[PDB]
Amino acid sequence: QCVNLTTRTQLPPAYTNSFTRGVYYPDKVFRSSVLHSTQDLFLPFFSNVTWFHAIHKRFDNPVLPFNDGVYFASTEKSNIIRGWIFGTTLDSKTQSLLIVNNATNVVIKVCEFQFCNDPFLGVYYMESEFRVYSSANNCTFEYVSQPFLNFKNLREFVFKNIDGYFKIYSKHTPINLVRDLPQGFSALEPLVDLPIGINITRFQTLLALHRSGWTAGAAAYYVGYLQPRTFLLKYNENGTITDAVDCALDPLSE
Amino acid sequence: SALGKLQDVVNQNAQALNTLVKQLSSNFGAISSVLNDILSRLDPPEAEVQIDRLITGRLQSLQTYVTQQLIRAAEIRASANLAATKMSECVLGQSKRVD
Amino acid sequence: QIDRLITGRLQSLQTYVTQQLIRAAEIRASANLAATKMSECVLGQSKRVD
Amino acid sequence: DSTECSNLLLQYGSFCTQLNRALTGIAVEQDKNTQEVFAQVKQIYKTPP
Amino acid sequence: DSTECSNLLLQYGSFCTQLNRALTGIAVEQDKNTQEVFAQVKQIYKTPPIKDFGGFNFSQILPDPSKPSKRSPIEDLLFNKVTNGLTVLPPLLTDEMIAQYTSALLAGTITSGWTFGAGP
Amino acid sequence: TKCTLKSFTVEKGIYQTSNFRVQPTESIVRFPSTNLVKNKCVNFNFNGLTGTGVLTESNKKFLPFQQFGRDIADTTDAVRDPQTLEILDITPCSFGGVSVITPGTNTSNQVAVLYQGVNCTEVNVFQTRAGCLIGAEHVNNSYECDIPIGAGICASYQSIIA
Ligand SMILES: *[C@@H]1O[C@H](CO)[C@@H](O[C@@H]2O[C@H](CO)[C@@H](O)[C@H](O)[C@H]2NC(C)=O)[C@H](O)[C@H]1NC(C)=O
Ligand SMILES: *[C@@H]1O[C@H](CO)[C@@H](O[C@@H]2O[C@H](CO)[C@@H](O)[C@H](O)[C@H]2NC(C)=O)[C@H](O)[C@H]1NC(C)=O
Ligand SMILES: *[C@@H]1O[C@H](CO)[C@@H](O)[C@H](O)[C@H]1NC(C)=O
Ligand SMILES: *[C@@H]1O[C@H](CO)[C@@H](O)[C@H](O)[C@H]1NC(C)=O
Ligand SMILES: *[C@@H]1O[C@H](CO)[C@@H](O)[C@H](O)[C@H]1NC(C)=O
Numbered sequence: 001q002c003v004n005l006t007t008r009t010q011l012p013p014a015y016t017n018s019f020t021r022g023v024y025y026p027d028k029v030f031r032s033s034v035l036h037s038t039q040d041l042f043l044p045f046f047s048n049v050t051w052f053h054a055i056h057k058r059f060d061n062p063v064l065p066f067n068d069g070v071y072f073a074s075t076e077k078s079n080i081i082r083g084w085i086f087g088t089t090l091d092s093k094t095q096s097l098l099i100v101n102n103a104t105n106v107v108i109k110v111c112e113f114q115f116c117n118d119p120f121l122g123v124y125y126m127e128s129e130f131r132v133y134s135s136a137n138n139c140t141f142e143y144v145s146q147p148f149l150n151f152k153n154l155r156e157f158v159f160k161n162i163d164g165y166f167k168i169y170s171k172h173t174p175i176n177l178v179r180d181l182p183q184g185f186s187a188l189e190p191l192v193d194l195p196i197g198i199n200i201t202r203f204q205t206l207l208a209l210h211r212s213g214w215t216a217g218a219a220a221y222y223v224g225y226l227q228p229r230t231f232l233l234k235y236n237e238n239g240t241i242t243d244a245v246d247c248a249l250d251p252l253s254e
Numbered sequence: 255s256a257l258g259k260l261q262d263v264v265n266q267n268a269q270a271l272n273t274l275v276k277q278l279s280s281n282f283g284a285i286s287s288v289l290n291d292i293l294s295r296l297d298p299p300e301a302e303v304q305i306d307r308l309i310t311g312r313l314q315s316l317q318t319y320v321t322q323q324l325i326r327a328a329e330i331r332a333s334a335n336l337a338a339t340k341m342s343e344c345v346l347g348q349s350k351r352v353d
Numbered sequence: 354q355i356d357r358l359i360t361g362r363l364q365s366l367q368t369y370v371t372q373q374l375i376r377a378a379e380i381r382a383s384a385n386l387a388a389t390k391m392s393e394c395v396l397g398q399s400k401r402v403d
Numbered sequence: 404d405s406t407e408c409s410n411l412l413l414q415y416g417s418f419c420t421q422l423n424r425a426l427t428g429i430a431v432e433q434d435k436n437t438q439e440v441f442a443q444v445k446q447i448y449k450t451p452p
Numbered sequence: 453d454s455t456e457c458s459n460l461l462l463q464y465g466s467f468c469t470q471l472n473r474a475l476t477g478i479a480v481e482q483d484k485n486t487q488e489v490f491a492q493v494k495q496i497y498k499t500p501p502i503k504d505f506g507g508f509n510f511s512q513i514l515p516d517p518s519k520p521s522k523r524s525p526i527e528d529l530l531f532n533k534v535t536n537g538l539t540v541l542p543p544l545l546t547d548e549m550i551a552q553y554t555s556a557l558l559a560g561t562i563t564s565g566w567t568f569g570a571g572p
Numbered sequence: 573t574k575c576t577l578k579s580f581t582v583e584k585g586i587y588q589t590s591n592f593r594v595q596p597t598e599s600i601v602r603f604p605s606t607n608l609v610k611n612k613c614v615n616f617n618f619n620g621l622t623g624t625g626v627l628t629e630s631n632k633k634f635l636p637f638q639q640f641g642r643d644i645a646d647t648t649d650a651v652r653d654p655q656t657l658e659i660l661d662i663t664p665c666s667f668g669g670v671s672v673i674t675p676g677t678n679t680s681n682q683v684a685v686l687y688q689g690v691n692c693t694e695v696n697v698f699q700t701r702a703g704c705l706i707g708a709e710h711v712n713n714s715y716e717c718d719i720p721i722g723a724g725i726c727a728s729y730q731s732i733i734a
């Protein structure tokens with residue numbers, strides 16, 4: 001089942017500053033009281049991060065490129081953002097990745113889904129609406145896990161695809177900032193490594209409607225793109241990354 | 255920065271040791287920098303070549319480290335000879351030499 | 354072939370840097386002697402013979 | 404300017420950093436030598452006319 | 453610990469012996485340097501218990517009895533202000549013995565002037 | 573010492589002659605496998621990570637994602653066991669130089685051995701900061717330095733005393 005959403009309001013997507021967000025642990029190695037220089041796919045400091053809104057009538061589900069990797073930030077309250085879609089053509093011709101977080105658990109499936117133009121979930125005012133794909137014929141990988149999840153909650157995710165391995169990094173942050181990304185530092189812990197082995201060039205954000213037509217809950221998300229670069233990370237005495245330096249940002253940090 | 259002269263020598267020696275230890279992580283054109291990985295992954299006819307590449311790279315690194323160690327040893331020996339001269343002429347007697 | 358050129362040029366550069374370090378040590382010794390002569394012969398009268 | 408040569412040169416590690424640091428040490432040593440030899444007075448004296 | 457690597461390394465000859473010999477020469481040279489600089493007196497001189505030097509105060513350079521290291525306040529400040537087959541050999545002269553040598557030199561130059569450097 | 577110096581007569585002094593490495597007594601494999609042996613120099617294989625070391629109980633506070641710990645030189649100094657989630661330090665196995673302290677062969681054939689940087693319990697036994705000294709008796713009297721051992725310790729012949 002697919003449903004076209006025809007009540008959107010036309011508005012260009014916004015842009016804002018990344019500040020010092022998007023740093024994740026590059027590996028599974030404990031390091032204490034050290035300064036470590038690593039060259040990996042990172043989000044540049046103070047970069048131009050694209051801002052999308054969900055407010056009522058804004059419902060931002062565009063087609064975005066994946067490129068080398070995607071940093072996904074979410075200023076979220078009341079649980080509208082539910083999952084992501086990854087693939088190349090997003091149809092039954094190629095094989096695509098599904099990540100969803102419904103009311104019970106987190107489901108990851110790698111199947112040839114015939115995706116809808118507007119994939120979505122729904123909350124009735126209980127969850128009783130799911131319209132993402134119309135079919136699933138060839139499934140190779142399945143993974144059912146625990147639930148991962150004024151704006152009160154900050155969700156950071158990093159999606160990378162190297163050597164057929166999909167690395168998902170996650171961090172949950174209590175915030176009290178009203179509109180934009182808070183300025184500070186928080187290192188993203190590695191969440192899961194999936195051996196999906198599929199080509200990914202395009203991705204989709206999955207939202208949830210509110211029914212009482214449809215109403216969009218107040219939410220905002222940010223999309224940034226990873227680039228191969230070097231960071232200098234500082235590990236404290238407790239093994240937590242507390243500060244970082246972008247090696248190619250300015251001559252002082254260089 | 256009063257004690258920079260001693261700290262410079264300490265930093266140089268520690269940096270030379272860190273570079274010499276760090277050079278083991280380099281494969282020098284071989285498939286891996288770990289000897290056990292090469293010995294467990296390849297047959298001895300090609301593992302001999304890979305081990306030879308690792309040996310020549312590490313030997314070049316060690317010879318380089320010994321070369322700068324000898325040069326720094328010569329510099330420290332000259333400084334120590336000067337210090338012994340100052341101990342003999344300034345502390346154990348009064349020196350007429352200006353400055 | 355590029356590896357052969359790299360190792361040859363790297364050996365040449367290491368040889369050059371090593372001999373430059375030795376000459377730098379010699380020039381530093383000569384400059385220390387020159388500073389001693391500046392302090393003791395120009396800024397004062399020296400009783401040291403020759 | 405060969406990128407393949409630099410990619411192969413990265414396998415050898417930090418030899419280039421050591422050579423650059425040694426040359427930098429020699430270069431600052433020359434300035435230190437000149438400073439020790441000639442800058443032994445902090446007053447610029449002049450002869451009478 | 454690779455036996456095959458050592459067998460291949462034996463084809464290159466006595467490079468390892470040369471490197472070990474050079475490092476050993478440096479290591480003994482450091483001890484010779486310390487002997488040449490600090491061990492220039494064969495008598496361990498000591499200051500008198502009464503510090504009556506005609507108004508001259510040497511408390512900042514003489515060893516402190518309260519400190520276990522028997523160092524001067526200046527020497528204590530100096531020591532506070534300085535911070536895979538590799539081994540570090542300890543120096544032949546420890547820090548307390550070097551401090552003892554400096555204390556002997558200070559006692560000689562305070563109580564005897566330059567006479568102790570040229571004889572009795 | 574005679575073989576190392578390539579001479580049948582050895583002068584008085586200390587001579588570096590050999591290298592002492594504590595051989596791995598057992599091999600331990602831990603996969604998600606053999607028993608876990610601690611406080612001994614053993615070979616270890618943790619999740620495909622091979623090495624040789626002594627496993628001791630660790631006071632580090634590894635976060636759940638973190639598995640093996642690296643030091644300044646990027647060597648694995650701590651590891652988490654994949655079956656029982658506990659942290660173990662990996663100290664490198666005891667290695668050191670073996671030096672032979674002897675007087676002249678004209679005087680005597682008695683020798684003492686110094687294991688540099690090696691504690692005496694992993695090898696006339698005397699523990700010095702320079703290492704473990706075997707074959708020389710320690711005396712409380714102080715003399716001039718004849719054969720330098722290190723860390724203020726010297727050796728002489730009068731038997732060999734330290
Ligand atoms: C929702 O809208 C999309 C966009 O118009 C529809 O996708 C089109 O589907 C028709 C089916 O005949 C194709 O011919 C078009 O080429 C599609 N357009 C694009 C851009 O893909 C989709 O079918 C609509 N959903 C429903 C249920 O009608
Ligand atoms: C010599 O100098 C020392 C240090 O300058 C003097 O020690 C000070 O004595 C006063 C008065 O007793 C104390 O308040 C200071 O704290 C002391 N300084 C230190 C560093 O302990 C000492 O009195 C001087 N005279 C003699 C004869 O020793
Ligand atoms: C971000 O990009 C938009 C256009 O893509 C541009 O108008 C805006 O000025 C950029 N922001 C910054 C801070 O450069
Ligand atoms: C969430 O998805 C899983 C997988 O299909 C399903 O078994 C479960 O019932 C779903 N929960 C809800 C509340 O729909
Ligand atoms: C994928 O699905 C189609 C139709 O369901 C089928 O014809 C094809 O053989 C499948 N391919 C694989 C590799 O299973």
Ligand SMILES: *[C@@H]1O[C@H](CO)[C@@H](O)[C@H](O)[C@H]1NC(C)=O
Pocket residue numbers: 088199200201
């Ligand atoms: C992945 O998809 C893109 C776009 O279709 C294509 O350009 C690229 O060659 C593909 N890569 C692989 C390894 O198939």
Ligand SMILES: *[C@@H]1O[C@H](CO)[C@@H](O)[C@H](O)[C@H]1NC(C)=O
Pocket residue numbers: 236237238
């Ligand atoms: C590290 O943890 C200890 C408690 O184990 C805490 O007291 C200390 O403040 C922590 N350090 C930092 C930098 O947070």
